[PDB]
């Protein structure tokens, strides 16, 4: 660890890239599924012709 202390920039950029990917996954899910702002409920009656 004391030897690796001089590669802090390399580790910081690695963790930054991975954190960006991780946030991007949640963003992708939000764009795909969270388009509708209201949670509509199915009607009790299913008279859909």
């Amino acid at each position: 660890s004391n030897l690796l202390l001089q590669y802090g920039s390399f580790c910081t950029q690695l963790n930054r890239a991975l954190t960006g990917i991780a946030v991007e996954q949640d963003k992708n899910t939000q764009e795909v599924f969270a388009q509708v702002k209201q949670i509509y409920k199915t009607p009790p009656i299913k008279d859909f012709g």
Binding site: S1, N2, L5, G8
Partner: protein, 46 residues
């Protein structure tokens, strides 16, 4: 020759908290407007 003190009023040793004290310059190189990471023998905070 020395004299051994005989009057004694002893209590348990008190303890206090070191509020971010005991930091020293790790080297003799001038550094300005930089943020530097170093491992050494330091007095841990608090």
């Amino acid at each position: 020759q020395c004299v051994n003190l005989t009057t004694r009023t002893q209590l348990p040793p008190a303890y206090t908290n070191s509020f971010t004290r005991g930091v020293y310059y790790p080297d003799k190189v001038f550094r300005s407007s930089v943020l530097h990471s170093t491992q050494d023998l330091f007095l841990p905070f608090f």
